[PDB]
Write a structure and sequence with these properties.
The protein is of the alpha/beta class. It has 13 helices and 10 strands. Bound molecules: a molecule of 2 linked components (XYP-XYP). The site of a molecule of 2 linked components (XYP-XYP) has 7 residues, from loops. It catalyses: Endohydrolysis of (1->4)-beta-D-xylosidic linkages in xylans. It is an enzyme of class 3 (hydrolase).
Length: 327
Amino acid sequence: GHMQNVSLRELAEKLNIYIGFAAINNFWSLSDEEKYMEVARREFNILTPENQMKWDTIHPERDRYNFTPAEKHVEFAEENNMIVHGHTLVWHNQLPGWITGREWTKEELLNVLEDHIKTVVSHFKGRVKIWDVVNEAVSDSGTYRESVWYKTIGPEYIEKAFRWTKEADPDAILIYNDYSIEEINAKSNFVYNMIKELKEKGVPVDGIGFQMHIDYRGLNYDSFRRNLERFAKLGLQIYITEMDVRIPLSGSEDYYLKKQAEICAKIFDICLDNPAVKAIQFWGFTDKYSWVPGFFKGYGKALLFDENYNPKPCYYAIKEVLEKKIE
Ligand SMILES: O[C@@H]1[C@@H](O)[C@H](O[C@@H]2CO[C@@H](O)[C@H](O)[C@H]2O)OC[C@H]1O
């Protein structure tokens, strides 16, 4: 015969791709830890720690590293035949006080950056298959974002981060990850020309991550498909890293859950049609545990499973698209 439950990760493996999630902080000690862990191992073969590899947790003082929470994320992916997607080495948010609380000069922040990168990347060498090296380096104007990194160091912090990362783990796939660059627009044009110049200089930018924090309005699918093609032609691997499809909390639940399913299906169709797309992840998987309600005033219910871990319409919609693709 054949196996009874036809999970997303089983279907992902027959497509030679990964489908997964972001693991909440301290997932092993949730009140409902057991259920959370079970759904996650049943469904997924790639795991990104939601926050526990961020600068705040992992490097809370200039001369102290804390790998403890991160190691728990990695052990769980390992015991569960998942690969680990590392997040994130350089970003403007969730920085500890010893970084934000003092003025820096260029040479000192370069030295700080290199130490952080080499320490975390070497510590997890060979155990983290994909690194978000730089996260959200580009403003909502398609100019460079005016972070502590940029203001202190200049644009070179980007290439140096990638080069330092590759040194510390040559087998890691190094990516640049951003939001709102799924379509052709001012922001993705800037990211495009940016990666195009870094690769021409020999910087090891292996891939691009499209966060895919979207809502019930969907995307311009033609623009998204054309955007994936131009990036792939740069010789990049492509990762959907943080998917969620937030819907208004007010009024017709069924209508919005139906639009959510259609969107998820359309996004998978396009992604499965382009062989440079290697993983699709959701920024979580159950609506019980999502950053959306707290960040996006008036929206929620953005994930695969409801608050009781029952699959929602999008889940079945994506499974059906996965199954058709194999068929
Ligand atoms: O718990 C929350 C996380 O889900 C949130 O993660 C970020 C959301 O925006 C993405 O573009 C980032 O890459 C990702 O790290 O960060 C805030 C935290 O409180």
